[PDB]
Design an enzyme around this catalytic site. Structure first.
Site, short mmCIF file in Angstrom:
data_model
loop_
_atom_site.label_atom_id
_atom_site.label_comp_id
_atom_site.label_asym_id
_atom_site.label_seq_id
_atom_site.Cartn_x
_atom_site.Cartn_y
_atom_site.Cartn_z
N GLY H 60 7.03 56.42 0.91
CA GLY H 60 8.37 55.91 1.07
C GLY H 60 8.39 54.41 0.86
O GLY H 60 7.49 53.84 0.24
N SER H 89 1.38 56.67 3.50
CA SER H 89 2.14 55.42 3.47
C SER H 89 3.08 55.36 4.67
O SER H 89 2.58 55.38 5.81
CB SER H 89 2.81 55.33 2.09
OG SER H 89 3.69 54.22 2.03
N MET H 90 4.40 55.27 4.48
CA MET H 90 5.32 55.24 5.61
C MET H 90 5.20 56.50 6.46
O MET H 90 5.42 56.44 7.67
CB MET H 90 6.75 55.05 5.12
CG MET H 90 6.99 53.75 4.36
SD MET H 90 6.51 52.27 5.27
CE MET H 90 5.00 51.82 4.42
N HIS H 114 -2.64 53.99 2.65
CA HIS H 114 -2.34 53.40 1.35
C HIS H 114 -1.03 53.94 0.78
O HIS H 114 -0.72 55.13 0.88
CB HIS H 114 -3.48 53.71 0.38
CG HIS H 114 -3.19 53.39 -1.05
ND1 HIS H 114 -3.25 52.11 -1.55
CD2 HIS H 114 -2.85 54.19 -2.08
CE1 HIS H 114 -2.95 52.13 -2.84
NE2 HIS H 114 -2.70 53.38 -3.19
N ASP H 163 -7.20 53.98 -2.08
CA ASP H 163 -6.41 55.19 -2.31
C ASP H 163 -7.27 56.40 -1.95
O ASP H 163 -7.96 56.98 -2.78
CB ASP H 163 -5.95 55.23 -3.77
CG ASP H 163 -4.98 56.37 -4.05
OD1 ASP H 163 -4.73 57.20 -3.14
OD2 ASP H 163 -4.47 56.44 -5.18
#
Lengths: 187, 192, 192, 187, 192, 188, 192, 188, 193, 193
Positions: H60, H89-90, H114, H163
């Site tokens: 996001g 991520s988010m 990441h 990643d």
């Protein structure tokens, strides 16, 4: 294709009132989220009574299938799975994920362990993944299929490399399902 | 283009479904097959004894979808009346002949064809995934089921499914595809 | 995205065609097959004796198209060198193995697969028109041609075309799909 | 799909300079007009020398096929026809329309008399026709196929009702072609 | 475009259907035919004896759809009043003449034509999918049905279906297509 | 999908160099303008020598057809017309508009004076037209068809009401064409 | 967008190609790879000994395309100068390091990254079509080739291709990815 | 494709009636607004009782994630977070934002701090942002991740550069979650 | 963007007050919806008056004729009100109201001419032949002459002219009866405002 | 709508006069075309001057940096002319000309600020990480400071402000050298007009 209603709610919400979940399309992320929503709802309503999952899915993405599989294992109730039409890739995974003894197939059903070529993640399309994550997700899928069918991880890997379908009897012999039914539920 | 009925609101097809009437009036696709299977499972849950009526006006479809619907129909314990209104081709004719014997009707000007009109490549077409062993398997299933439903041999079924022509109601009765021709709500005499 | 050459102007592919070089670097479709056949017929009309070079980087294609191209290649009286750059799958691998024996090369990191990756339903897809007798016929043709080109038996060809995996250059040489691995303009040694 | 050029003109214009016409798509009205233009041009250039027509057509419309057939019969020169890939419906009609003895097929070619379902006129789509005109156009097609192959109109009608392909040898026996060639032109 | 009526609620067409009034005011297509047949079966399920009213303002349609609707109309045991408002062409005129004799009306400025305008290759698919023999058979059916409904001979029906012209209400009465011209619920107890 | 000819030009421009005009689509306003341009060019190049017009048109619009017809009558040279395939509605008009004795059809050609649908002006599938002008355009079309075929205006109206095709011999008897040719030597 | 040069004429990229200069300034896709390989084969056909210049400004690409181009570069018998202008990421960095040692340059503000940004499921099809084993094999190939080109070990190459970060020109020299940083045709006789 | 439940409402509204919020897509601005609306509603209905948030998000935008995170910290009730499938991520931010001890993951779940691509503000796939504000938003994200996981801000920066995904046990060791549950009884 | 008002949209409420709105181009689907509303209002109560508000830029002759025959088919009185503009078929349906109950608002515009590209109808695929143009145009002319009191010759000639009339010109033409300003059924003489 | 002028479009003719046009947003394909033109002009004659006319509303840092490195990579003098507006990357490439040969037309507008939604580039799929934003922004700031003579601190602070400068303000800023009105290389003092 129109969706009929029943005394008001659509046909799928009525079947869900009967604790019946339908998975009859490609296993994508929004489909997986809808299926998980239905499963959590059925668990909140009554966590003991059985759930029915009818599967007619041509395939899907490993991330979605793993989410649904973990949600099914997360339930404390029994899960009857029925293959109508075909169960390929994630479809076959969810089919074999049902509680042992309650995994059925219709007489002309076709089941396939082989993975679509773009069936790795399918965030959008198939695209978002790296090498270590491909290896991890494929090892997860292989281990879960081996545990569900009773085959070895080696046999699961080799057969998932082979693009062929099994009939219902071939699936019982494989460990993917338990019974072939031409009559309602256990009968 | 969807009329409703209150006699509590629902469309016309949902009312007919309350009368245990299922409509198959488009090409037999995977979403169509899934909605049809949902309707059949619901009719089974409501009352497994009372008869079901399936009205068929289908141009054709897919064997994967058609076989899903056929296995679901065989999966029911109640009697299944099938009615050909308009045309029944390929999967349409398969499901038409799948009704319980004596309860497969056609209207007088109905047309029936076992042949698949074109793209005899039947499969989920959003991602068409099918091959030589699976083509032979699905088509052998279709031929065997048509032979069991009509009383013809698999050889005659294969050879006739190779030819692109339609039958009238009387030819369909002689073929074993249907049983009776109805010209009124009371089940009119057959073979005319 | 199309560069030109004047040394009288034409694109890069037309210049390579002047050097008797045909490029097949996309999926084997009907328009692709027709342009390839046009190029081959033109190269035949210009000089039937000098060799032709076909560079193949194809993800797959259709057997109807692939068979048209293959029959056209067999139709030529000159030698046909085939070079796998990148990948050769399905029809790509068929046309690769169709080159004259001893003149089928692959670059060191090339990947080859006889399997059709998905939609094993091969046919003119603008209007897909194919059926059981014709599926078996086209696939029997493909299997027999692969067996004749590679030296494998039709049984092993069928069973291996059922499995979705790629071969490296050395595996392709052992399979009979190619002959030599080239790491320079001079035809480098094979089997490494 | 890119179209290469030759010392400037495209590849098809070069082949046309060699008196070679390509018909490798569905026989539609614009295709028929382009083919007739090419045929009239080749006739004006030299009306005696032979013309080569390579056919790889999945089908087409009866009106377009009849236009092309009449244009081919209208030429005073010999017409070699070669089936590469498949010749179905109008494709097979034009294949058998070549001068007798000069109708060839490649070894793996497939030929079919059967008519696509929408192959009646195809002005736009397939649509513009009435009952008497359907009967007239189909009688025309049947008579022309019977004259070209030597079969009876009855045999032509029955086989055009049957959806199946013939191989090259089956086509020679049928009267659709003359020779199977694995080498250049007559050889 | 879609008004409602609460009398909890339903659109205007569902309200008229509650009064046993079916509307056919567009081109007779396959989905339109399926909705019309659904409505007719529903009206039969509610009450098979009471009359049905069909208002027709259709520019034409397809023979498969028109024949499906006609067979469904013949399938009902009740009387069918038909009313031509505006134009009834091709299948529209067929359904218009299909009403029970004495109950086929047209409004004073109505126009009726048995000819199918624009070239009629009737098709199961919206972009039609039928062979020559099946179109010829369906058109023979249409001629026979129009001859029975109007009282003309099949020869005259064929000749007039070749002719692109409209009839006024009086020419339609003389033709046997309709029975009466009404300007204000003049006949048979003003049902609707 | 448009071939070229060796002075580079497409196939239609080469045929035009031989004084051959192709009309193988529906007679629309831009098609009529291109045909009229070609005719004016052939007139300027040589106003005496014959022109060849090959017609394979399913129909068209009365305004475009009338523009083309007036241009054809406007030329001082002979105009050979050849029906290949189908000539319907305006197509049949332009076919019969060629100089009499120079109107040919191929053996399996189909011709129809009837316009199958919306016999409207058709500026571009959406009309422009009023009652007096539809009547005027249809009267012009009927008078021109009667002059070209020799039929009466009444017979032309009645047959343009009928949706049917004529064969080559029926078209010869009708006055629409003159002869059916199965070989380029039969051309005058 | 497309300038020309008459020197009858050709676009700017064809002129630079006339000077034996190939441009790779977009994402490494399959058609881009095919045009690049065509240009390389053409430059070899004209003169196999003289040097080629490849200017790289590519954000990334696909391993099948990148490996095809790399194998073609290794296939040439001439020296290949590579110049990084802007950024060379993923396949861009691969082709950058593929130049002959001593002739791999970067401009002062160039950025280079071996990591494939956004998630790399390399695909033959633009929307990829590859199985797990083939992606894993292709990535092992990529690691081996990067290790040979840079002099690092395959372990370090794998670890750094996991890391989403860019290197400046000096970090790239220390890494073995390039050889020299040029601000004005400083080295080896200023070829281009 | 959205089922209903018997008081008619869709499946998500029923789960919301049980105080269950679903986050199964990319964290965008409208998604963040809907989630914040649901959270404010659950707070007004009963500010004391726990909330359940099931997370299956591929990623996001930092602005949407920060809005949701501030709203979650803004609630006075306990927030159980469950990672089903993937939390990247988010997604991983909101997963670790639940009250500590109430952060669960299913056995085959994958988690990654990441952000795979364009770590941009992402108003709607086209940026809005300047150098000082990208630095500010990334500093906020790093500080919040360090507070949630217990790692150092330095380790958070370094790992958000990498990643890779973590399994359930690796995520427990990282401080991202607390326990891996294969059965609803294991929930406090 | 259609508000509601035991739930109904604004048009369904107005329909409960026996008010039909015609505020678009007279097309075939519009004609079918309007005829449905008229038949429903007839079944509900065939004696009570119906109100038709017309704000139509034009339409097709087949649709307009269908609606006109349906209006004449009703046994009750039909009040018609021109709000905004009523052109071509709009003016026809406006003049179709019962004599004495055809109103226009003070700034209303009425035109019998069919503006730009007139035919018989049937939307994107036209469907018109030579005899049918004359038949439908004769029908329209005769109906306008009977509704307005003009002769068919004057109706044809004036339908050839592209111009609009105000409310007072429409009263003189026979198209309407009264101009209703600031009140109910009060003419423009303003002896009653 | 691009005229021609032995045939060439207008831009190819200007390129024959060693004139490169930059009249669009500095995108990745634009950067590639401009770099192609610069490399070609270098191969044709590496000593003779090049003319770059800039009318660019902005662009992406990766494209602008690629072009800037290519310009610095040339051994010849580079005249840059601001016609219309030069913002963000436009102003960067404008200031990249050889000292004394950076001109602006009298009503030209220049702004170092990146207007609405600035990043490093790469079109529809962004591709930017935390360290890379800082690196590319530091590169842009250092290059602008070296080109203009301002300090990097002032460059950062002023690039935070969304405002345009006229030609004289750009001369004072160090962005350009001369204002060319009605003539060739004649400043705005008009002692030479």
């Amino acid at each position: 294709t129109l969706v009929p209603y029943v005394v008001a709610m659509d046909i799928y919400s009525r079947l869900l009132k009967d604790r019946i979940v339908m998975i009859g399309q490609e296993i994508t992320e929004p489909l997986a989220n809808t299926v998980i929503a239905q499963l959590l709802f059925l668990m909140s309503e009554d966590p003991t009574k059985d759930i029915q999952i009818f599967i007619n899915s041509p395939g899907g993405y490993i991330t979605a299938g793993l989410a649904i599989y973990d949600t099914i294992r997360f339930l404390g109730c029994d899960v009857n799975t029925y293959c109508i039409g075909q169960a390929a890739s994630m479809g076959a995974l969810l089919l074999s994920a049902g509680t042992k003894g309650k995994r059925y197939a219709l007489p002309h059903s076709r089941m396939m362990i082989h993975q679509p070529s773009g069936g790795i993640i399918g965030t959008s399309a198939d695209i978002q993944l790296q090498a270590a994550e491909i290896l991890t997700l494929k090892k997860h899928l292989s281990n879960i299929l081996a545990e569900c069918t009773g085959q070895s991880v080696e046999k699961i890997i080799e057969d998932s490399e082979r693009d062929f379908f099994m009939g219902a009897e071939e699936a019982i012999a494989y460990g993917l399902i338990d019974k072939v039914i031409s009559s309602a539920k256990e009968t």
